[PDB]
């Protein structure tokens, strides 16, 4: 009994001009764009109520993709920052019949290697949580704290340190209020969990796979080019 | 005026039996083993006084490599843990004429992408430092601290968090005493910097390139397979 959920993929900030240095979400990953493979991670899930991609209105790459003509993929307008784009995605879900108590998953457009196991694991562990949570991976590299002169002040106990991944799973109404209030407050919002944390909540960490990586350099594609199929 | 230095490559812990799942230092990286490309990062440096690789006495892969028959590559016996193997490397340097005040660089055998720029940068910034230091990279992923129930207690300020890389550069005599004393003390030694930290010193962080990665999975090879030449 996995819970029903909506999905928001923030994918705005793309200029109106096509560039040789393409946005990472439109790079080729074994014959398909990154973002097309990212949507593949959700679109077939039986509990998906609907998916919204947040895009710049003048995105020049999106209208060429198959998913741009799919009724299973809704569209929302990008914001001034990622939080505002996520916010617009929430508003789009509200037009599509979403309820304040419905679960929403926000996921990076450049994380195309999300396995069904991780997705279902996140869904089952948080289904009856009062706030929600996020996929995350234990820190494996040795972590040093820097003093003001650039010298090691301490080696951080990485046994309690987790790298924050996506999807991040929260209730629609609460995430809507956290994001909206944190924006007007001037909070430096990174991910959705950072907004819930500012609003006073403690998101649950759900352990995922480390190879659910975000494509931040074209070099990161090379790690994934043998991961499909 | 870059300082003269010795190099220690800890590369022991290899069983006597060849295995299909080879040690990472013996995997192929564009036609050469990882460790052969790692040695390439130091062997031609004009200020290198000598290089010691720490190896299991019964290492079945090493005698097949070109560098196993190179007079420019010295050999030391592996220890019970990495620290002990590094320690044995220091003892080998002392037999080769090394002085207590000589700089020593310890580097991971599975970091074959160390560029000459990083190496020279480390050498010039620490040449007149009282203790030494290490290459390191700023943390770029969002970092969450976990409470005892697996919920986020805080988002760590990653502006002060650095991932510890190699080489790590310290004086021979001091590193010898730190490692020896920390072993008998029972300290959980990770890298050489962790031993200097326990001995009371604050290593200087020197910023390096992020793609000086350690090969921990065969997937990590894919990121580097286009990096040579
Ligand atoms: C430089 O591009 C980004 O940072 C992308 C980011 C962004 C910026 C501004 C508005 N919306 C967004 C959005 O959805 N993102 C995923
Ligand atoms: C599982 O292999 C390792 O952890 C490798 C490690 C090690 C272990 C035991 C003794 N010496 C060493 C050494 O030099 N290392 C680099």
Author numbering:
A (entry chain A), B (entry chain A): 5 to 233
Q: What wording appears in the published article?
A:
The 2‐C‐methylerythritol‐D‐erythritol‐4‐phosphate (MEP) pathway represents an attractive source of drug targets due to its essential role in numerous pathogenic Gram‐negative bacteria and Mycobacterium tuberculosis (Mt), whilst being absent in human cells. In the present work, we set our focus on the third enzyme in the MEP pathway, namely IspD, catalyzing the formation of 4‐diphosphocytidyl‐2‐C‐methylerythritol (CDP‐ME) from MEP and CTP in the presence of Mg2+. Here, we solved the first crystal structure of Pseudomonas aeruginosa (Pa) IspD, the third enzyme in the MEP pathway and present the discovery of a fragment‐based compound class identified through crystallographic screening of PaIspD.
Next, we embarked on a screening campaign of a library containing 192 fragments obtained from Edelris (Lyon, France). In total, we collected crystals for 51 fragments, from which we obtained a handful of co‐crystal structures. Among these, we identified three fragments, which were in complex with the protein. The initial fragment occupies the CTP binding cavity within the active site. Since all residues involved in CTP binding are conserved between both homologues, we assumed that the cavity had the same function in PaIspD. Within this cavity, the main interaction between 1 and the protein seems to be a hydrogen bond formed between the pyridyl nitrogen atom and the side chain hydroxyl group of Ser 89 (distance=2.6 Å). Interestingly, this hydroxyl group undergoes a similar interaction with one of the nitrogen atoms of the cytosine of CTP. The rest of the atoms of 1 do not seem to undergo any other obvious interactions, with the acetate tail of 1 being mostly solvent‐exposed. Based on that, we hypothesized that a similar binding mode could be obtained by truncating this part of the fragment.
